[PDB]
Subunit: 86 residues, 6 copies
């Protein structure tokens, strides 16, 4: 139940990232969050290997259409963290 | 009619002009606009792949004329889970 | 078929937008249909009417915004499609 | 029925402006608007002379505690403009 | 107990530390916080003039320690119409 | 009397905040009480608990935020007044 996250400056890069992630591997899109300042984060859940593959694909995609700001995976997130996810 | 075209501008005027140019350039459907702060506005259309490419190219040119274009992209066949984060 | 003409003025700041709006409705027989704000301090005011009225209004509004130092964008769409009409204030 | 407007970057300057305006002359506070980007506008209504006096006082005050961005008076605003005021 | 003290910071942490320092420095009442975008957060207290001056000075020092202070001001006797635009 | 200790981490970006939050709750017995966003991309995550637990959590969270490049502010208030408690998530 790993968590993968990609943050972009702009919604277009985030949607491209999200689409590339769920196409690339056996992950599920948890949703998107807009925190202001133009930053948009999209997130997926799945096995750690699938989430690594998905986030690599998403980050490559975001970078080509937009502004990749960050990409990270948390392999075993703590249950409380779900409270602040989309 | 599943392809998705997206145009993002800094400013609303650019996005409205983009949306109007899109729907006039080809038979595509305007599905909404989203604002994410810092002035960034995105407008999106759906349609068949060819129409969406033509529309998004036209929209991008229109946004460049009146405003500030930030991003332009077409996804020919979005994953079904992606529909759930669209406006 | 097309929807009524649309004139739009975008300013950095609300004061410029209100000055623009006031000048627009004073200059011509147009309807002020609202304002929208998209962050970063950008505010857009919009009018609808006949094409000539909207052109005259928007030119007056742009001048007023530029006078007080706020003008980012100005544009008229003489014959907007209804699809777009549907995403306006 | 003149309209006076002061825009500041920050709420503190706007509240100081508003307080100084209504203290300075026979004007009424219409309200405040926050348009994003940190910009806050406060507005008053009254006779043109009162609104000129009020806005001068408010602008002087905003400048001392904060960031005055703009100050302007519209002497005879058109009725449609009320639709987009606070 | 009508005086108004206001502290504005870029960032929420600075504002929370300011608010805590204010209410600990003197007998003043925290009346709320407001966010106006671009990261700017304002916290406000009410109290008697002396207390509010002391509290706001303490709050400002606390905000400077942990964050970014933007503005600090005390209005001893706000106009009654000003209450209507406060949080 | 005072309310439970409070630890806060502010980051530029949500990814840094989630990394911080995860590290905080992993490092100590604290309650994650929420996140707040105030524009400009700034996100704050907060935990409550006993003072020592909150100190340990917040130190772990700050490290994690700094590792991924996002850290703006970090602070613990060991004994917050309830008035403040009242304006938190």
């Amino acid at each position: 139940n790993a968590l993968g996250m990609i943050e972009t400056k702009g919604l277009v890069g985030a949607i491209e990232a999200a689409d590339a992630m769920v196409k690339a591997a056996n992950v599920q899109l948890v949703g998107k969050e807009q925190v202001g300042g133009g930053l948009v984060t999209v997130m997926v859940r799945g096995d750690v290997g699938a989430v690594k593959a998905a986030t690599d694909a998403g980050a490559a995609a975001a970078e080509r259409v937009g502004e990749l700001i960050s990409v990270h995976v948390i392999p075993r997130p703590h249950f409380e963290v779900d409270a602040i996810l989309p």
